[PDB]
Design a protein around this nucleic acid. Structure first.
Lengths: 125, 208, 138, 100, 151
RNA sequence: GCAAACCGGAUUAGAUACCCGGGUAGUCCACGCCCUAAACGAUGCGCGCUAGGUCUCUGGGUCUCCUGGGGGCCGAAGCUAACG
RNA sequence: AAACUCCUGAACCCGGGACGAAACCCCCGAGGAGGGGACUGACGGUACCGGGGUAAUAGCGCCGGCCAACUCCGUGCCAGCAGCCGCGGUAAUACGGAGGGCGCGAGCGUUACCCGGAUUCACUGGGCGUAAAGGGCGUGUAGGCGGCCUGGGGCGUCCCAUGUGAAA
């Protein structure tokens, strides 16, 4: 780099590739869906996890899962692509609202209702 | 807001008792003496060790506790104190007590924090002539925290008065039980009107 | 070739002050006269001269050796903590007013080259003048 | 205040017009070291009373031709062609690198 | 009578046709709260052994510093290996601010306010050693004079 | 002389390989194209300063030595995360 | 903590109620100064002053490591957790729930996006003997850096004086 080699060039900034090729800032994008599959986190697991094929309101399939056990959809749902890789499904990424036009957490959870649906369990009686 | 409820149940939370709920929190129990240690089933096991960041944090939270406030306004005015070109932390301490709720508390007219705030809110207090409601009110050297004319004609206020006559003011805020009033002066500090804490610890965890 | 002979000089400061040698042998120039002038003046170096070796005008600088320290090995504490070549044949750095460095935020010491010859940090500070930055020491 | 600059006259190859090549100074914002670059201002010589090598002073004016701004004041010196030499040498070396 | 204070420990291990025998270590610093500080690298089979013994090796590898105005003099930087620590004095209204271990030893030193950053390799040990020698290189105007006045 | 590729042979569960009998490309000469390479110091060119104890190619000075550049052993200070 | 007690008066109604509005114009001196008569309020009987005044919404996230908070059945590489290492291959503080607990509070979380960190495009602030990385070596072109003194120009430079650097 020695003063001169420095003066001539100017060391390329950074340029990021981002972890969400959902494009046009889509941490909420359409999700139309189909298929189901299963796979496994690397080696020691086994489960299910859907595959929401989306098409966004722009394009393309991806693998969209949800929170957890207990689905609700049949098709459509407008599942809003979210965005987070976990220890498998080479990509994982872009989970689902759970609420919108389908899903809504499940029916039995006492915590993450802030996205696992269920307004207020409210003992009521 | 201001927690409210099982208040000095949280006095054993610190592990330390405080002039918080006033009466039932000084004399023979802050809910203490009966039992002093962090509440819940887990209180007297055989504790471990809080990391530096954690204990310093603890100290900060204790500060927001004795003053009884959301760390909102608190933290904001802290960096506001960093703006003032003097030694940030200490200057901050003076300008920290300066809030009229617990100011009027240690000035006398209040037994507990909850009290002081409740009262000032209801327009029960008038500094330098103007009757207001704002308890989050800092005061300049030379004011006059007078009390309302019907608030002098109230009772538990007199109780607070006479249950005090024999206490040296924080060497600046004179108590006028002649017609219920308080004369405001100067700026003390952690050496003048101190309290059992270390300030620059809080300061050191504060901004990382 | 040494288009930067000053660099060679302070280089031999590192060398000779490390190897601890009574005084080092080097060439001469008016600049370096002014240099060791201030260098010795601000109580840093011990000496300099205008002698000759092999019939050529050579400069030789003494060094300042403080109290003989001990520990697991003598190593007398050297006044030359460290020097540094600033206006490198490339960075013709220029400076005047609050453009003055600090070096050790208070103490330290530096040297500069203005139309008023070779000055120092606190000196040119009082002066209210400036020029070009050349070297530093502590 | 009409700004002027000391420039080196080149290209007599034109009628009543010469093109001055100049080189200006500046350090570097955030690196340091001074710099000296190409900028060729347009030298307005009414009867080609100036030519190659002869360095002169150049003067900013009003648009006189297609892009031709600037003009010419006092001459500086002759016996030149050395700077010019370096210049066109660089030119040929421009036209010495290819993608064919 | 000082202030016996720790830093961290180490779980050293290796295997053989007799098992996979470990070995343990303790990182301790003896500090009189404010003044003379001392680092202690204790290496031993059992844990509390290494604890107290690294405490006493701290009681052996001593130093102090010009505790100048609840802070330090000049402003400096020190590298050991490929790890380096950064230093500049700060008046009150700044406090002791650095990484875990740095602030730790600085409390074993009695510091009140000091700018200190860390750069390069980020390994506890080398950092601590760098600390110790950097401590040994803190001067005053006095120490300035012995050198800058002549002999 | 030689040897890919190639053939059988031998060996092996298998032998598109070692061990075998052959045998060409080619190895070589001409000019020309390759324009490659662990083109190896895994270490750009130039000047300097900081211990020498010891063999050695050459150059000189009438010479146990001094000395001007190289081929190595060692290791002072210093550098490397460590080897170095 | 509650319950129980003594307590003030949110919200709620009653009496009043703004500022923001003195111009312009008219009369006067001249239609110039000054003074004097005066339309002029949507906002909205609202900020607020007085009275009577009643105890009256609390919710979110974490509880393996980075992090401060762990006790209990269930779950058995199955159902799930998932920022990074990983947790269940039936004694799971990491998955469900329960309790207590920790952060916060009209706020609490989750995701998208720039940066400090990150000295990880290294100017303060980098590396290329084995960790990314020295050209196949020669070679010289533009380019950059220029051994010792005397003076000359004083473009770059330095300080000093001034214009600007608007407001926010």
């Amino acid at each position: 780099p020695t003063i001169n080699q420095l003066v001539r060039k100017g060391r390329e900034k950074v340029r990021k590739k981002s972890k969400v090729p959902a494009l046009k800032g889509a941490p909420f994008r359409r999700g139309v869906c189909t298929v189901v599959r299963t796979v496994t986190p690397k080696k020691p697991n086994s489960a299910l996890r859907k595959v929401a094929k989306v098409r966004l309101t722009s394009g393309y399939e991806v693998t969209a899962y949800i929170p957890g056990e207990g689905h609700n959809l049949q098709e459509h749902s407008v599942v809003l692509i979210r965005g987070g890789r976990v220890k498998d499904l080479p990509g994982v990424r872009y989970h689902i609202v759970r609420g919108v036009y389908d899903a809504a957490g499940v029916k039995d959870r006492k915590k993450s209702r802030s996205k696992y649906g269920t307004k207020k369990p409210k003992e009521a009686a | 807001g201001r927690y409210i409820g099982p208040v000095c149940r949280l006095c054993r939370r610190e592990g330390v008792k405080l002039y918080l709920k006033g009466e039932r929190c000084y004399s023979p129990k802050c809910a203490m003496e009966r039992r002093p240690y962090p509440p819940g089933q887990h209180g007297q096991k055989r504790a471990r060790r809080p990391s530096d960041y954690a204990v310093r944090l603890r100290e900060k939270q204790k500060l927001r506790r004795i003053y009884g406030i959301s760390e909102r306004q608190f933290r904001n005015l802290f960096e506001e104190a960093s703006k003032k070109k003097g030694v940030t932390g200490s200057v901050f301490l003076g300008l920290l007590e300066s809030r009229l709720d617990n100011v009027v508390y240690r000035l006398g007219f209040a037994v507990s924090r909850r009290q002081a705030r409740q009262l000032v809110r209801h327009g029960h207090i008038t500094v330098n002539g103007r009757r207001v409601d704002l308890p989050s009110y800092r005061v300049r050297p030379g004011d006059e925290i007078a009390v309302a004319e019907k608030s002098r004609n109230l009772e538990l206020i007199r109780q607070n008065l006479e249950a005090m006559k024999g206490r040296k003011v924080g060497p600046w805020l004179s108590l006028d039980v002649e017609g219920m009033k308080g004369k405001f002066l100067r700026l003390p500090d952690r050496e003048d009107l101190a309290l059992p804490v270390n300030e620059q610890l809080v300061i050191e965890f504060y901004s990382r | 070739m040494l288009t930067d002979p000053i660099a060679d000089m302070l280089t031999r400061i590192r060398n000779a002050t490390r190897v601890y040698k009574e005084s080092t042998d080097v060439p001469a120039s008016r600049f370096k006269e002014e240099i060791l002038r201030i260098l010795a003046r601000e109580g840093f170096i011990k000496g300099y001269e205008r002698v000759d070796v092999d019939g050529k005008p050579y400069l030789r600088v003494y060094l300042k050796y403080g109290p003989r320290r001990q520990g697991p090995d003598p190593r007398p504490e050297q006044v030359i903590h460290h020097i540094r070549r600033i206006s490198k044949p490339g960075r013709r750095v220029y400076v005047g007013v609050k453009e003055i460095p600090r070096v050790r935020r208070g103490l330290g010491i530096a040297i500069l080259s203005t139309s008023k010859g070779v000055l120092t940090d606190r000196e040119a500070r009082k002066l209210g003048v400036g020029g070009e930055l050349i070297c530093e020491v502590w | 205040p009409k700004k002027v600059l000391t420039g080196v006259v080149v290209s007599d190859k034109m009628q009543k017009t010469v093109t001055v090549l100049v080189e200006r100074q500046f350090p570097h914002p955030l690196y340091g070291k001074v710099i000296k670059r190409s900028k060729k201002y347009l030298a307005h010589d009414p009867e080609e009373k100036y030519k190659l090598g002869d360095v002169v002073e150049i003067i900013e004016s009003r648009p006189i031709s297609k892009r031709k701004r600037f003009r010419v004041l006092r001459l500086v010196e002759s016996g030149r062609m050395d700077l010019v030499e370096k210049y066109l040498i660089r030119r040929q070396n421009y036209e010495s690198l290819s993608k064919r | 009578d000082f202030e016996e204070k720790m830093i961290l420990i180490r779980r050293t291990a290796r295997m053989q046709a007799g098992g996979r025998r470990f070995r343990f270590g303790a990182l301790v610093v003896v500090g009189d709260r404010q003044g003379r500080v001392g680092l202690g690298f204790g290496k031993a089979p059992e844990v509390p052994l290494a604890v107290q013994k690294a405490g006493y090796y701290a009681r052996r590898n001593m130093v102090e510093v010009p505790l100048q105005n609840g802070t330090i003099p000049h402003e400096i930087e020190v590298e050991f290996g490929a790890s380096k620590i950064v230093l500049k004095p700060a008046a009150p209204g700044t406090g002791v601010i650095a990484g875990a271990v740095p602030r730790a030893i600085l409390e074993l030193a009695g510091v009140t306010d000091i700018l200190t950053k860390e750069l390069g390799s980020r390994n506890p040990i080398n950092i601590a050693y760098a600390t110790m020698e950097a401590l040994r290189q803190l001067r005053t105007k006095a120490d300035v004079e012995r050198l800058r006045k002549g002999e």
